[PDB]
Design a protein around this ligand. Structure first.
Ligand SMILES: Nc1ncnc2c1ncn2[C@@H]1O[C@H](COP(=O)(O)OP(=O)(O)OP(O)(O)=S)[C@@H](O)[C@H]1O
Ligand SMILES: Nc1ncnc2c1ncn2[C@@H]1O[C@H](COP(=O)(O)OP(=O)(O)OP(O)(O)=S)[C@@H](O)[C@H]1O
Ligand SMILES: Nc1ncnc2c1ncn2[C@@H]1O[C@H](COP(=O)(O)OP(=O)(O)OP(O)(O)=S)[C@@H](O)[C@H]1O
Ligand SMILES: Nc1ncnc2c1ncn2[C@@H]1O[C@H](COP(=O)(O)OP(=O)(O)OP(O)(O)=S)[C@@H](O)[C@H]1O
Ligand SMILES: Nc1ncnc2c1ncn2[C@@H]1O[C@H](COP(=O)(O)OP(=O)(O)OP(O)(O)=S)[C@@H](O)[C@H]1O
Lengths: 721, 546, 115
């Protein structure tokens, strides 16, 4: 459908208010040679021109010059929509304005000298807010139509008296009235943006569609998450896209008002939101307005949040208004606004991943002339724990680092030939301290499942316990029986238990949340065991997901002669989870000694898998995937070291890899050193480095521990009385 | 528009209690010769949030026809200093100016929290104004007040005296049949596709309040709108529909807000699925159901009751389901708090949670308690110093449970040595029942009641599980059934993969599936612990003082 | 070169008595910018109602000159955490400061600094 789809491109005709199209698509749209259209593109901008037929123009593409393309605030390659405008009236009064940095060097009136020959019976239809270029005085000065007596649209007639009141303001004429950035300015949360758009699609293009949905899906959406992730910018983009009268206020902006002035503008925003049948409003920084009763210590703020609670449901079913909320902590808001009547739905922006940060960098480095030398990809995958505003700060710091290697006398050439380098991104990345760390964020691993030695029976067992209930919802209703949601891991301390957990997380293509036992006792050290409940709520909101509770020996070693209330809280909210939502939980320990055998009960994590030592192709497999700043070792006998059992006990064959490649580092640095002293560094790794790493090798786990785990091969018979 | 008596479901008993309470502003208006007490003003509604506390009051007001002058909590608190009396005096003035009337206040925690929790003096002024105008308007024009909250102990306890707000009725969570009734009354203004059943979705949903079922209906309808291509006509208006997959999608992307509340209902576990424990079933049946459904036989000659019993045996044994079984065949609701759940409120010195649990046990008579897994408390008091402080709260609160009021207490443990022997030696919890390694026919009973995508295994050696004796150390024999499930799933994906690469799913589980499942099976408890547990067959000789 | 607003707002933390006033004084008297500093306890000393007075006027005086820099001193006295703000006028003062800080974005390229 939607037969007005067009692609912007370079223009053949140089007319400022005339664009080009194709004749059979003009006859498809019933267009004419001199009719007027309304080109609607991105940033909800509108342009009015006259479409001329061009035979060399494409059918699905539109040709427009630098006047029309900058009128829509689009670059080369965006998408627009075309609507012909046949009801045009004639202009009576026309007012235009110049730009302050383009009028020096010339003096005089621009009406009879510039506006007159540009509109010398030109029949150019103009739009309010559009910029038109007038060539004159050996120059090219841009002017903007600000107000006309036919205020939306008119045709410049020779009888139309045109005003000439000169008020040059700025080059930034559209930065405060609209700030009209749309969905192009937001990436990394396309699912969340789609969910938000599908929530607000009853304000926009479904106005009276309440017969089909009489439940009126909820007035009030929360946008919580980390600070600096664009929670304000999401609301701004949604308000720009919807086109309703937007009346956002800030929390400190109304806390700055006094008593009596507090109800002032709080009643007025909700009253002014009534006057439009499409209407969306938003209130910012809810922690300033709605804390807990214990946090606040004043009657004025509590009266303010009481008035907010009154005005939330004081209006109902009236012009389907939607309020929006923003905060940095989910539990910080008062629970009186978390009821099902008021502010019901809660979605979280979170932080973007490597693909998300790649999208943010790609849409952020557009308005900066790079040297076309960087990759924009190592920086994309490297910046873990970097929020989008921190990414913008990194871009600004890289720009400052690229500028700072120049002269203070600016240049004759630095403005039109500015550039950034790849090493500038590395130096901006090194000297960066972001605040987006310390959160147990969501991610999907990339852990290339043949990189393990393989343990094919155990990997197929993990496959059967995880993904066949996942990828077959019909087998949750046709064939099979009750499932077992959860699996425990035990065996040697140094092995690939975390590696198997992230491997089945990647192979399931599910979300991977891996909290730590020391991190759990860190959160308990602040005296808060509701954080476990918030972890499980993040897990349920991240459905489907895979959960990982690593280092249970850290919990086990705090038995005493602190307390084990954290594992008791985990066990209480382990069986208090639904068998639906496709959530899944993985546990892992190092020793079966102090494992608290109340957690081995069925109905919980039940499957006990003893991981043995892997085969001879474990460190072969990490040398098979040896990207790791290093070439692959060649012309060497790999299984000959497996004959010698080079620490062949569980993991830490990568310790031998580290030792041998550090020997290669020593060899390459010494080769470079006497090459420099003299006036091919052997990047590959050969047999003598591996043999010397065998010489300086020790076993990671003893044989007595292996005997203990062999005795604990059947350890599901616990709770001995 | 306005709503009536037919829009409340799942709490018909509490709704009938409210109708009996408002029967005096109704069919018996001048009922003073029968009773001179004027049975109390101040109906208090408490329970979970969003459960219909406004809806019940509005429906009762519209059925009775009395003049309704309701006010809200934060609406009254939104007034400044000097306007707190404004509309608070005036609502009672309007209740004075017309005799047959009812008023209602919502969100009582917003108006009147505890006085320690208050900070400003105007909150104390407001709660004193309420405490004056409640019983100050005594026997004037027969008005009834109503109060709604989200938590009962967060209310100021001065507002819960005899003269003020005594008849606490709990709305609670709806039942599974209550969820069915809520969905039945919520699909009136929606033309469905006549393909869903509204029952498998209802029992598959757990811990959702009626507002959450309304939101689930909204989410399913929005999914059905979203999958349709949007076009601005009425051709999508008349073709509104919901599918079963739309209900499964709405059940998936949602969260149970009423979960973690201690649930009060009857389960559906149906005694016949027991493995062959006959003596334990008969003794529990005689000690539980016999006083309940035969009160006249429980008033003439015989058994003066001794409530309280605890189960013990192997740790992987079948002791949990019998409490649900007597809940099904006693017609009593089941309250099962967890021993791990007690230490959550022990952390923070919150002793009032056990008080709330026993108050819920009083409110939900008849009931059967179940303190599951006391061995976790034994671990917390044995692995380190302490834990063992809520176990003193258990002993103190259980003596508040009188021999009447139709209550029972069921314990549970695994290792009976360290369960604080003052628990069982007095008349409190005096009886002890051993739960041994089970009888031979548990495997058919697991296969009978749990249907679960597969029939009974056809033409197999059922007696071979009594012959080779798989899992022959206590219960959790159902690991062999889980392994049969995994092997059946492996066969199904084998046939699916072969017919995928090639271009009969074999839904029957055979004998060789169980024979292969035999190999991946061990015992559930070491034999020395078994010898110690039937050495503790006579373990009532506790309190081992020197 | 960079339109992503090179940063308005610099904290000068660390140990006290290391000449953090002296750094701002040297920058003010060297960089050729009209300097309009205000003191923390001086504006905390004002009464209720007059607390917004000179708080709005400092940012107005920053708006008066097209190049301008201010430097608030001892923000630790001005803005503690919400638990330590048991007085309403402290929350009102920091709300006025935050409102004037975020309401003014890239207006006459002003820089704010705090110690
Ligand atoms: N996803 C994003 N892509 C590009 N720029 C972003 C993004 N998120 C934030 N920014 C930039 O960061 C600034 C806006 O950040 P904020 O709106 O303050 O973030 P926030 O999530 O709303 O946190 P608050 O509101 O300050 S608590 C602008 O300069 C944006 O250009
Ligand atoms: N079989 C294996 N094949 C390849 N790499 C392995 C193998 N076993 C261990 N490794 C590597 O060694 C690392 C050990 O990580 P972990 O699985 O966290 O170790 P662990 O045994 O779980 O003990 P901790 O306390 O978690 S470090 C893995 O991340 C891999 O990089
Ligand atoms: N029993 C019920 N029958 C039908 N709809 C119900 C029922 N309970 C709740 N709802 C729905 O959920 C909404 C909840 O409305 P309210 O009665 O205002 O809840 P509430 O309990 O007063 O909210 P709070 O947070 O406890 S003050 C109703 O408007 C209905 O749409
Ligand atoms: N004789 C039996 N009849 C019916 N179900 C049984 C029988 N024996 C065991 N089961 C089932 O086996 C499982 C384990 O029994 P439970 O009493 O629940 O164990 P538990 O009391 O929870 O103690 P653990 O440590 O968690 S195994 C349950 O799903 C029971 O339904
Ligand atoms: N970096 C420095 N270079 C030169 N002299 C310094 C330096 N740091 C401190 N001094 C000297 O030490 C004095 C410190 O002055 P103070 O005003 O007391 O420091 P201050 O940091 O402004 O105090 P507060 O508590 O932060 S307002 C200066 O006047 C100098 O004499």
């Amino acid at each position: 459908n939607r037969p007005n789809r067009l692609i912007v491109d370079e223009a053949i005709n140089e007319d400022n208010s005339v664009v080009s199209l194709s004749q059979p698509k003009m006859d498809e749209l019933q267009l004419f040679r001199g009719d007027t259209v309304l080109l609607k593109g991105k940033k909800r901008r509108e342009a009015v021109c006259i479409v001329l037929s061009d035979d060399t123009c494409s059918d699905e593409k539109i040709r427009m010059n630098r006047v029309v393309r900058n009128n829509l605030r689009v670059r080369l390659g965006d998408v627009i929509s075309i609507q012909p405008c046949p009801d045009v009236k004639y202009g009576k009064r026309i007012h235009v304005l110049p730009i302050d940095d383009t009028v020096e060097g010339i003096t005089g009136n621009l009406f009879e000298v510039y506006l007159k020959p540009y509109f010398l019976e030109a029949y150019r239809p103009i739009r309010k807010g559009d910029i038109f270029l007038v060539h004159g005085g050996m120059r090219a000065v841009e002017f903007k139509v600000v107000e006309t007596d036919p205020s939306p649209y008119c045709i410049v007639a020779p009888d139309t008296v045109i005003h000439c009141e000169g008020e040059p303001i700025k080059r930034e004429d559209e930065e405060e009235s609209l700030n009209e950035v749309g969905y192009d300015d937001i990436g990394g949360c396309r699912k969340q943006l789609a969910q938000i758009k599908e929530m607000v699609e009853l304000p926009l293009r479904h106005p009276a569609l309440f017969k089909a949905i009489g439940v009126k899906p909820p007035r009030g959406i929360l946008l919580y998450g980390p600070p600096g992730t664009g929670k304000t910018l999401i609301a701004r983009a949604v308000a720009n896209e919807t086109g309703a009268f937007f009346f956002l206020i800030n929390g400190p902006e109304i806390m700055s008002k006094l008593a009596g002035e507090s109800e002032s503008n709080l009643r007025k925003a909700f009253e002014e939101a009534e006057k439009n049948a499409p209407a969306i409003i938003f209130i910012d920084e809810l922690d300033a307005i709605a804390p807990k009763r214990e946090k606040t210590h004043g009657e004025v703020e509590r009266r303010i949040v009481s008035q907010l609670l009154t005005l939330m449901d004081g209006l109902k079913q009236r012009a389907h208004v939607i309020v929006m909320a923003a905060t940095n902590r989910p539990n910080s808001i008062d629970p009186a606004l978390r009821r099902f009547g008021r502010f019901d739905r809660e979605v979280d922006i979170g932080i973007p991943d490597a693909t998300g940060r790649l999208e943010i960098l790609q849409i952020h480095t557009k308005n900066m002339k790079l040297a076309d030398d960087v990759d924009l990809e190592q920086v994309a995958n490297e910046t873990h724990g970097h929020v989008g505003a921190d990414l913008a700060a990194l871009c600004s710091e890289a720009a400052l680092q690229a500028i700072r290697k120049k002269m203070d006398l600016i240049d004759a050439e630095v403005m039109n030939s500015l550039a950034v380098t790849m090493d500038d991104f590395r130096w901006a990345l090194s000297q960066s301290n972001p605040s987006a760390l310390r959160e147990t964020v969501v991610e999907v691993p990339q852990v290339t499942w043949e990189d393990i030695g393989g343990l094919e029976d155990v990997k197929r067992e993990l496959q059967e316990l995880v993904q066949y209930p996942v990828e077959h919802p019909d087998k949750f209703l046709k064939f099979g029986m009750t499932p077992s949601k959860g699996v425990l891991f035990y065996g040697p301390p140094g092995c690939g238990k975390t590696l198997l957990a992230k491997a089945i997380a990647n192979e399931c293509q599910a979300n991977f949340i891996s909290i730590k036992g020391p991190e759990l006792l860190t959160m308990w050290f602040g005296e808060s065991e509701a954080n476990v409940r918030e972890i499980f709520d993040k897990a349920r909101q991240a459905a489907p997901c895979v959960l990982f509770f690593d280092e249970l020996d850290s919990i086990a070693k705090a038995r005493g002669g602190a307390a084990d209330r954290v594992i008791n809280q985990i066990l209480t909210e382990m069986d208090g989870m639904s068998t639906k939502k496709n959530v899944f939980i993985i546990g892992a320990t190092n020793r079966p000694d102090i494992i608290d055998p109340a957690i081995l009960r069925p109905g919980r994590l039940d499957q006990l898998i003893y991981i043995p030592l892997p085969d001879e192709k474990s460190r072969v497999a990490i040398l098979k995937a040896n990207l790791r700043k290093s070439p692959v070792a060649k012309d060497v006998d790999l299984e000959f070291l497996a004959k010698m059992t080079n620490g062949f006990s569980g993991a830490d064959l990568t310790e031998i890899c580290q030792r041998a490649c550090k020997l290669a580092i020593r060899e390459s640095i010494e080769s470079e050193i006497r090459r420099e002293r003299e006036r091919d560094p052997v990047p590959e790794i050969r047999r003598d480095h591996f043999e010397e790493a065998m010489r300086f090798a020790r076993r990671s786990v003893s044989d007595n521990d292996i005997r203990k785990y062999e005795m604990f091969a059947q350890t599901l018979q616990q709770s001995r009385g």
